[PDB]
Design a protein around this ligand. Sequence first.
Ligand SMILES: [Mg+2]
Ligand SMILES: [Mg+2]
Ligand SMILES: [Mg+2]
Ligand SMILES: [Mg+2]
Ligand SMILES: [Mg+2]
Ligand SMILES: [Mg+2]
Ligand SMILES: [Mg+2]
Ligand SMILES: [Mg+2]
Ligand SMILES: [Mg+2]
Ligand SMILES: [Mg+2]
Ligand SMILES: [Mg+2]
Ligand SMILES: [Mg+2]
Ligand SMILES: [Mg+2]
Ligand SMILES: [Mg+2]
Ligand SMILES: [Mg+2]
Ligand SMILES: [Mg+2]
Ligand SMILES: [Mg+2]
Ligand SMILES: [Mg+2]
Ligand SMILES: [Mg+2]
Ligand SMILES: [Mg+2]
Ligand SMILES: [Mg+2]
Ligand SMILES: [Mg+2]
Ligand SMILES: [Mg+2]
Ligand SMILES: [Mg+2]
Ligand SMILES: [Mg+2]
Ligand SMILES: [Mg+2]
Ligand SMILES: [Mg+2]
Ligand SMILES: [Mg+2]
Ligand SMILES: [Mg+2]
Ligand SMILES: [Mg+2]
Ligand SMILES: [Mg+2]
Ligand SMILES: [Mg+2]
Ligand SMILES: [Mg+2]
Ligand SMILES: [Mg+2]
Ligand SMILES: [Mg+2]
Ligand SMILES: [Mg+2]
Ligand SMILES: [Mg+2]
Ligand SMILES: [Mg+2]
Ligand SMILES: [Mg+2]
Ligand SMILES: [Mg+2]
Ligand SMILES: [Mg+2]
Ligand SMILES: [Mg+2]
Ligand SMILES: [Mg+2]
Ligand SMILES: [Mg+2]
Ligand SMILES: [Mg+2]
Ligand SMILES: [Mg+2]
Ligand SMILES: [Mg+2]
Ligand SMILES: [Mg+2]
Ligand SMILES: [Mg+2]
Ligand SMILES: [Mg+2]
Ligand SMILES: [Mg+2]
Ligand SMILES: [Mg+2]
Ligand SMILES: [Mg+2]
Ligand SMILES: [Mg+2]
Ligand SMILES: [Mg+2]
Ligand SMILES: [Mg+2]
Ligand SMILES: [Mg+2]
Ligand SMILES: [Mg+2]
Ligand SMILES: [Mg+2]
Ligand SMILES: [Mg+2]
Ligand SMILES: [Mg+2]
Ligand SMILES: [Mg+2]
Lengths: 148, 185, 51, 222, 53, 156
Amino acid sequence: PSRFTKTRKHRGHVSAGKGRIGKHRKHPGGRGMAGGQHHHRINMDKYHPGYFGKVGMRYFHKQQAHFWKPVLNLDKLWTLIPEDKRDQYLKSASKETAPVIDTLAAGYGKILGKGRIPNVPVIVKARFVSKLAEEKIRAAGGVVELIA
Amino acid sequence: GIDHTSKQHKRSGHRTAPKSDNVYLKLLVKLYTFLARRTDAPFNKVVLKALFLSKINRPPVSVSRIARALKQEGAANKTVVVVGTVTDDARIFEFPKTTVAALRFTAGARAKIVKAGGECITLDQLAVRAPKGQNTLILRGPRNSREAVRHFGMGPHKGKAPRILSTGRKFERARGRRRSKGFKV
Amino acid sequence: VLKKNPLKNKQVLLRLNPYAKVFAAEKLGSKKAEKTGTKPAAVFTETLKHD
Amino acid sequence: AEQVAAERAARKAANKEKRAIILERNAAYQKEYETAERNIIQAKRDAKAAGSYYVEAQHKLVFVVRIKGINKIPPKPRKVLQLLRLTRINSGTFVKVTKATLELLKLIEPYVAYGYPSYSTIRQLVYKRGFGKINKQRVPLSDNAIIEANLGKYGILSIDDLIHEIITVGPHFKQANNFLWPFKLSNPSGGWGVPRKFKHFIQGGSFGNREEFINKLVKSMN
Amino acid sequence: RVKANAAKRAEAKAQGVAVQLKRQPAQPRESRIVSTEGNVPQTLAPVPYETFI
Amino acid sequence: SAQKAPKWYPSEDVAALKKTRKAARPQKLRASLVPGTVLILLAGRFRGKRVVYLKHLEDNTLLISGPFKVNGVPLRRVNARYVIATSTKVSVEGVNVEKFNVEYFAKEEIKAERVEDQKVVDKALIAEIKKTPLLKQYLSASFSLKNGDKPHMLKF
RNA sequence: GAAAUUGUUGAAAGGGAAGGGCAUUUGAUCAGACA
RNA sequence: GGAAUACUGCCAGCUGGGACUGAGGACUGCGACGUAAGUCAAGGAUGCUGGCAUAAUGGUUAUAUGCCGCCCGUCUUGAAACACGGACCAAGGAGUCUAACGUCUAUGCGAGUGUUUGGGUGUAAAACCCAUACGCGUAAUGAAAGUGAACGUAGGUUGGGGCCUCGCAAGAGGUGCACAAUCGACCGAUCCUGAUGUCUUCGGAUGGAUUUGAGUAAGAGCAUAGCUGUUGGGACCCGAAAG
RNA sequence: AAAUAUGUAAGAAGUCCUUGUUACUUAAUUGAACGUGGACAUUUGAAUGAAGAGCUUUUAGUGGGCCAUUUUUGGUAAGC
Ligand SMILES: [Mg+2]
Ligand SMILES: [Mg+2]
Ligand SMILES: [Mg+2]
Ligand SMILES: [Mg+2]
Ligand SMILES: [Mg+2]
Ligand SMILES: [Mg+2]
Ligand SMILES: [Mg+2]
Ligand SMILES: [Mg+2]
Ligand SMILES: [Mg+2]
Ligand SMILES: [Mg+2]
Ligand SMILES: [Mg+2]
Ligand SMILES: [Mg+2]
Ligand SMILES: [Mg+2]
Ligand SMILES: [Mg+2]
Ligand SMILES: [Mg+2]
Ligand SMILES: [Mg+2]
Ligand SMILES: [Mg+2]
Ligand SMILES: [Mg+2]
Ligand SMILES: [Mg+2]
Ligand SMILES: [Mg+2]
Ligand SMILES: [Mg+2]
Ligand SMILES: [Mg+2]
Ligand SMILES: [Mg+2]
Ligand SMILES: [Mg+2]
Ligand SMILES: [Mg+2]
Ligand SMILES: [Mg+2]
Ligand SMILES: [Mg+2]
Ligand SMILES: [Mg+2]
Ligand SMILES: [Mg+2]
Ligand SMILES: [Mg+2]
Ligand SMILES: [Mg+2]
Ligand SMILES: [Mg+2]
Ligand SMILES: [Mg+2]
Ligand SMILES: [Mg+2]
Ligand SMILES: [Mg+2]
Ligand SMILES: [Mg+2]
Ligand SMILES: [Mg+2]
Ligand SMILES: [Mg+2]
Ligand SMILES: [Mg+2]
Ligand SMILES: [Mg+2]
Ligand SMILES: [Mg+2]
Ligand SMILES: [Mg+2]
Ligand SMILES: [Mg+2]
Ligand SMILES: [Mg+2]
Ligand SMILES: [Mg+2]
Ligand SMILES: [Mg+2]
Ligand SMILES: [Mg+2]
Ligand SMILES: [Mg+2]
Ligand SMILES: [Mg+2]
Ligand SMILES: [Mg+2]
Ligand SMILES: [Mg+2]
Ligand SMILES: [Mg+2]
Ligand SMILES: [Mg+2]
Ligand SMILES: [Mg+2]
Ligand SMILES: [Mg+2]
Ligand SMILES: [Mg+2]
Ligand SMILES: [Mg+2]
Ligand SMILES: [Mg+2]
Ligand SMILES: [Mg+2]
Ligand SMILES: [Mg+2]
Ligand SMILES: [Mg+2]
Ligand SMILES: [Mg+2]
C-alpha cells in the first residue's frame, strides 16, 4: 500500500533518492537484453554462462506426453498401499499372498531404487524398472510384473 | 573529539524478540525469558533465542531425523526438543517410543509418533517437566538445503546454478558451458 | 551518584586507606632525614671546576 | 530467621579485618618507598666520596599525555595512539618501558608529552581521576572493594595497592594498568609554558620526553 | 627455542620449579657505579670553523 | 470521546524526602568582630552610621546600639556582612546585654520596656565613650566615601 | 468569502535597501501559581 | 670553619577571599568521632530571616543598542557570483498500476501444496461448500538413443552448541544436531576394462580413470501477503530536429 | 650499497616416543603420506590493544574530482 512505500518518505528531497549526479533517466543501458555481447557481457558470462549460441538437435513437433514417465523410488512404493491395508501386509509378509501394487494405476512410469524396503514380499506392476529396483525387490522375495 | 576505532551506535545484530506477531509464541517467549534469567541452565538460554528465529532459520525436523538421533549411543531415553515444526517421513519403517517437544507437529508426524506410543509435548509442557532441560536432545534441521541457497555465490568456476526459469537444452547450456562453444564457465 | 575526591574530603580519604590516620598523626610527610656528612673526592671536585 | 545484625556481624567484623590488612600493607610500602629513595641518595654520596659516579637505573615507567587533537594524523602513528589508549586530546595512560614500547613512543613524539612520573603524581592521578574498566562501563574508584573485586585476583585489594603495582612496575603491571581507564585530564592551568606546543620540549615546545618535568605539567592538568 | 624450552622445563619441573621461559623485550639498564681510577674525564669543547682545501 | 484515555496514570502518592545530612553548626565571626568595637553600617535604614557592637545573637545577627542619644540609632539587629568593622573599641564590661535575644525582637508604637532598656545600656556606654575625647563626635557623624578614598586600600 | 494586492484609522521605525541570529533596556500585551 | 638563603621537589600541614552548581527522594553501602549513649561534612542542600503576592518575576511582541548574518533552487573540482529558473498570490502539479521475477519476512499447511476454469449454494458480484484435472515440488544426467542414487550403524577425520556421566568446585570423559573443513562411497555423462552367454554380432557383467553435471548421501516445498530490487509497458513529470 | 617501505615465523592445527595401512617408492617393512597407543597445561612460550570474533544474503548512490607537504615526468613557465 502506498502508505508504506518509500516514495512517501522521499517527498521533500530533491532527487527522489535517484541521485543528483547520475539522475534517473529513460534507458541508459539501452532497453531489454541489449548489449548482451558488448557493454553487458561481464554480467552475462557469470550469472549466465551458456546463454549465446547453440547445442544439440532440433526436434520438430515434439509432443511432451510421448515421454511421460514419472519416477517412484523403492524409497516410497509402500506408500502406494493405503495406510491401514499397509500394516496388514508388512506383518504376515509372504508368498501365496503378497500385495499387488499397480504403480501404473498410481500414475508412475518407472521404478527406481533409492533405498531399503523391508523384507516383506511385494508384487510390483510397472512399465519400467531400474536394474537395482528389480534387484532389491527380488531380495525381499517379491517380483516385478511388466505391464502397459 | 575522539578518534573512534569502531562504528558508533551499532545495533548488536541479533533478534531480541520474535518478528512474529503470535500471542502464543509471545507467551512462550515470556516463559523462557523467565527461565533463562532465573535458572542459569544453558538449555533455556538456547531455546529463548530459537524462539526468535525466523522461518528459514527454523527448517523442519523430520521424525526420521528424530529416529536417528535416538539411535545415538546413550541417547534413546532422551526427550528430543525441536523449536520448529516436526514433519513426517514414510521412508522410515520403524519409529521408536520417546517424547518429542516441539512447536508444531504435522498431522502425520504426530500420528507416527503416537502410533508407536510416544508423546508429543508443547514447549511449556516440556518446561514444567524439565525446567533445566534435564535429559534433553535439541535438534535443528538442515538450513542450507533450501532451494535458494543453490544460487548463492554464482560466478565462474563456482558450480552454482543459474537463476533460470524455463530449463532444458538450449537454456544456458552453450557458449560458456562447454569447451566447444567459446569456453567453459 | 556523585564522586567525592579523597584529596579533599577527609571522610573518604580515610574510607580508602586507613594509613592516612597515622601518616598524619606521625607527621611523616615532613620526615627529618639522618644528618651525615660524607665529603666528596678532590677528583670529583677538581673535574667539576675544571675548564 | 536471623541476619538481623547476625550476618551484618560476620560481615562488618570481616570488613574491619581487611582494613587491618590494608593498614599494615600501606604502612609497609611507605617503608619500602622511603628507604628505596634514601638508598639512592646515599648511593650518590657514597660514590662521590669514593671518587666515582653513580648512574641511576634508567626509568622503568613513563606517563604519556596526548597533546594533539584528533585531525590530520598519519596512519602509522594513528594506530599507535590507539594501542596506547590515547584517542582524545589530553587523555593520559601509564606505559611500562622496554625496547618494544620505547619504539612505540618514538613513533608518536609529535603528538604527546611524557616523562617520568613521581609517586606524588601517580598517587593523585589515581585518587582523583582514576576509574576502572568493569564490563566496560568505567567505574569510579572511591571504594576499595571495587578493586579487590577485579584486581584482587592478582593480590591488590586497595587503591594504594593499585598505585603500588603501577609505580614499581609490578609483576602484574599489565593487568593492573589496563584496569585503569585512560585518565581524562583538563588543560593545564598555569598554561603550557610556551607559545607553540607542537615542537619538541628541547626546542621550547611541548612534545616528547620531557623527563621529570612531566609532573609539573600533569599536576596542572589534574 | 622449543627444544630448548622443553629442556629447561624438565631441568626445572623435576627439581622444584622456577620455570620462566617466555621471551622478554630489551629491558632498561640497571644502576651502576662507574669509576675514575685510571679514568678521569677529559673535557671537550666545540671547534672553530676551518677550510682544508 | 475527544481524546483516548491514557493506558497508564502517574501515582499521586508523594514520596518522602531522603534523609538529608546537613548539621547546622555555629557561625564563628571574623576576628575583627569583638564586642565594644565601632561598626560602619554599609546598608540599610541607618546606612553610614557609626555604631557600637554589643552581642552576637543566636540568629547570627549583631546586636548594636547608637547609642541612641548620640546618633539616633536604637538597640538593633544588624547583619554581620553589611558592616565594616573599624579598629576603634570601647570597653563594654559595664553593659549588661544578657536580656537581649532573638525573641526580644519578635514583631508580635514603642513598648516602654524598649524605651527603658535603651536608656540603661546607653548610659553605660556613654560613661565610657566620654573617656576618649572626640569619640562621641566620631560616633555622631556619618561615614561616607570622599573623592579619592579607595576602600581596598583604606585602613578602618 | 482566504491570499496576492488596495483605501482609511491607530501605533511605530527610518543619515545610500529591507529582512535575520544571540542578548538585554524600553513600550504594549498576557498565562500560571498563590490563597 | 660554621651557618643563612636562593633554587627545585615533597607534606594523607594549617588557613582566608570569590564564582557556578544542589541531580537524587523512606531505609539499605564504605566509613569517621567517642569509654559509651550518641554524633557526623560518611551512597547528590539544608537551616534561619525578609520582601511581593502582582504584571512584581516570567512569556509574547514592537523598537532600540553590542556583536554577528551575501539569494535561494540547481549543475559543478569550485557560486553571493559578471552561471541559469524565479515580479507576486491561490488552486492544480511528478516513481504509478499491471505481467513475470531475486532476496528478505509474516502466516497457513507440509512430501506435499494451491477452494474461486468450473460445480454446488446464497441474506446474491460477498460469505459458505466441492468432484476431476492441472501447476509447481517430491530425481538427476546426456546433443541424443538412453540409463538412473546405501561397501558402511547413509562412512572416516577435525572443530562444534546443547545434553549425559564423574567431581564440592576447577575440571575430566561420553554423546555430539545445525554449520564449517577434508578425505571417501552412490547416480548420469566422457574414457578404459569386456565375465557368464549368443539368431557371429548381439549382449555389457565386473573393476577402474589429473575428466565431467544446476546431482544422492533419513526430503522442504506449495500458497497468500508486504517492503526493497529486476524486465516489458506513456513507465517519475514536462521536451526534439524528424518518419 | 642505505633510510623508508616489504615476505614468513614467534606452538595444543605444538613437541617427543612406541609401530599399523598402501596398488606409490626403496636394494631392502626402505621411504612417503595418513594413522592407532603414550609422555608434558597455561610464563603454553614476545609486546600493546581488543565497546568481541566469524559468517551469509541482498540492495543504493558513485564510476567529471580538486588541493597541501614530500617524492616526481613533460614544459622557459603557469592559478599549466
Ligand atoms: Mg507494489
Ligand atoms: Mg496506503
Ligand atoms: Mg507514513
Ligand atoms: Mg529519507
Ligand atoms: Mg531522513
Ligand atoms: Mg520529507
Ligand atoms: Mg539526503
Ligand atoms: Mg535509491
Ligand atoms: Mg536532479
Ligand atoms: Mg538465445
Ligand atoms: Mg524420493
Ligand atoms: Mg532437492
Ligand atoms: Mg601501555
Ligand atoms: Mg595553579
Ligand atoms: Mg588564568
Ligand atoms: Mg597564578
Ligand atoms: Mg604565536
Ligand atoms: Mg584542575
Ligand atoms: Mg545526620
Ligand atoms: Mg564557622
Ligand atoms: Mg546628633
Ligand atoms: Mg458574499
Ligand atoms: Mg528578543
Ligand atoms: Mg534536590
Ligand atoms: Mg532533588
Ligand atoms: Mg496575573
Ligand atoms: Mg509590585
Ligand atoms: Mg506595534
Ligand atoms: Mg524585530
Ligand atoms: Mg557583518
Ligand atoms: Mg543548473
Ligand atoms: Mg565549470
Ligand atoms: Mg564574477
Ligand atoms: Mg543551462
Ligand atoms: Mg529571469
Ligand atoms: Mg497545492
Ligand atoms: Mg446465507
Ligand atoms: Mg449478482
Ligand atoms: Mg454449505
Ligand atoms: Mg466432474
Ligand atoms: Mg544403450
Ligand atoms: Mg530424460
Ligand atoms: Mg581419513
Ligand atoms: Mg568433550
Ligand atoms: Mg568422538
Ligand atoms: Mg561416478
Ligand atoms: Mg560430458
Ligand atoms: Mg536441475
Ligand atoms: Mg529443480
Ligand atoms: Mg522499468
Ligand atoms: Mg512529445
Ligand atoms: Mg514531433
Ligand atoms: Mg511532426
Ligand atoms: Mg527514418
Ligand atoms: Mg612489518
Ligand atoms: Mg586487553
Ligand atoms: Mg568485549
Ligand atoms: Mg552494492
Ligand atoms: Mg553497484
Ligand atoms: Mg555501477
Ligand atoms: Mg557522470
Ligand atoms: Mg593538509
